[model samples]
Target: MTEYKLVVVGARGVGKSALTIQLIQNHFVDEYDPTIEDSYRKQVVIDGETCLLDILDTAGQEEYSAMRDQYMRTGEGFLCVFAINNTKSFEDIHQYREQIKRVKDSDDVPMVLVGNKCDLAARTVESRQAQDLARSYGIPYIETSAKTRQGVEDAFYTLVREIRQH
Candidate 1:
């Protein structure tokens, strides 16, 4: 089986863990504690190809910077998430992108910029800004809502397709 190390990262309360859980188990937690105890791992098959998708859901809080760095250094693919309703989390993409660039040994590692919580369209931050930022960084971007499973699978599968194509 082909194995890929994927990292899901963002500022606190941006739904990193929620997305992780939703993708791996098709489950969602309404109220979750923002803690970085351990990373989650699961296998997902796409297009009849078995690929081990190991996800490192890093704590969004700055206190867990060390652990975040460790995961960043080893990730083969990255999903940088920001809550569509939170501007602070969306602004933190610069930091996340810098860390990824610094730790990533390859210039071509796949990355997907995710604007989560799309279910709350009324509270969305700046949707076009998120897309523009991702474009500037040469990464695909998508809006997702883990609670409703909207674009959740698409966000992940897009990365999988990019990785395979590359």
Candidate 2:
């Protein structure tokens, strides 16, 4: 089976851990104990292909930030995350995309633009605005409500598809 390495990144409180915890472990933390990073593994099948997914859930807290280069180098696919309720979080996604290109040394890296906390989307940021940003970056966009477990798996599965496509 193919093994895919994935990285999750965004601002603090952006639901980065929510999606990761839910995906492989089926757990959620209303307030995740702030940590720098964590890892998880799962077997997944998409488009009839079963693969092993090695996930690196990176911390968004300023104090916990690590050398992003290592993650950029090791990961085969990436999830550039932001909370749908935070425009400031939404604003920096381009930087994430640029960082991937700079570190991967390529313009066409496999990626997905993730909008988390869709449960309060209108209260934070408009979906179309996020969608426009994703379109601009030439990546697939998914809105996930980590609280309700909505659209969570789609984000990872979409990334897997893109990784396999590349």
Candidate 3:
């Protein structure tokens, strides 16, 4: 009966829309990015419990907005996304982390590090490197291919679990 407010953020073209389009059944989805800035609300049964999960997809157009507090207070969790094929995208995760910490005024926030676009062959960041970064940040690391729906659900669901656990 509670809303799980989750935000998805990353550089542009990291398969936010592609992942989001998977929620055709009004089920849980977190195809987050900066462009759409829309929350995909769906009824999900996690552990046989029914609840509404609202996922915000901000597709690389992170606004330098004054509503940082609003943003911080709203989301229960975040999926910090990056592209496995692009090092720059991977490198930009620090900024996202910093922004969340600043806006939330705490580093002990519920967040997950996501490496998307796993279907590509030109990967610049290895899985171990991504995993290490996640460990350093004390967040879970998950790789997903939006095109193939690989690990996409797990990434969102994992964040949900983290949000609930924390």
Candidate 4:
């Protein structure tokens, strides 16, 4: 089995844990705790291929920077998530990108920009802006909703496919 380490990064409550849970277990957590510590790992088979996915769900809180840095170092690819309902989360993509580059020491790693919480369309920040930023970074972008299981698989499969092509 081929193993891949993918990091799920975003500000708190942007649905990082939810996305991970939905993709790995095909379930959702309604009342989630944002203060969760450390990272978690999960494995899944997609398209008849077994993938050991190390999902580093780092804390978004300020004190967890050191821990986050450690997780960032191990990531082969990144799923930079941002809530469609929170513009600040979207704005933090630059910071996340910089962090990934700093830790990986390579700008060539594959990344998927995930606009999460798309089910709340009424609270959308700016979809086009997110898409434009993703294009600028040369990262594939998709709107997702862990609640409805929308684009959940795409977020993981897209990165896996890219890795295979590389």
How large is the C-alpha RMSD of every model relative to the true structure? Answer: 1.7, 1.7, 3.4, 1.8
TM-score of each: 0.91, 0.92, 0.87, 0.90
Best by TM-score: 2
User: How far does residue 149 in candidate 2 sit from its true spot (Å)?
Assistant: 0.7
Better of 2 and 3 by TM-score: 2
Instruction: Output the better candidate (1/3) by lDDT.
Output: 1
For residues 43-149, write the lDDT of model 2, one tens digit per residue.
88878878898999887746543378878889999999998778888887877788779989998999998888878726567878888877887888898987889
Model 2 whole-model lDDT (C-alpha atoms): 0.84
Model 3 segments beyond 4 Å from truth?
24-36, 62-69
Tens-digit lDDT string for candidate 1 (11-104):
8888888888888888888996886644776777878888788777777776676556677778778888988888888888888788778777
The local distance difference test score of each candidate is: 0.81, 0.84, 0.78, 0.81
Please tell me which model should have the higher TM-score, number 2 or number 4.
Answer: 2
Count of backbone clashes, every candidate in sequence: 0, 1, 8, 0
State in Å the error of residue 85, model 2: 1.0
Q: How close to the true structure is residue 158 of candidate 2, measured as C-alpha lDDT? A: 90
Per-residue error (Å), model 2, residue 151: 0.1
Better structure of 1 and 2 per lDDT: 2
Clashes of 4: 0
What TM-score does model 2 achieve against the real structure? Answer: 0.92
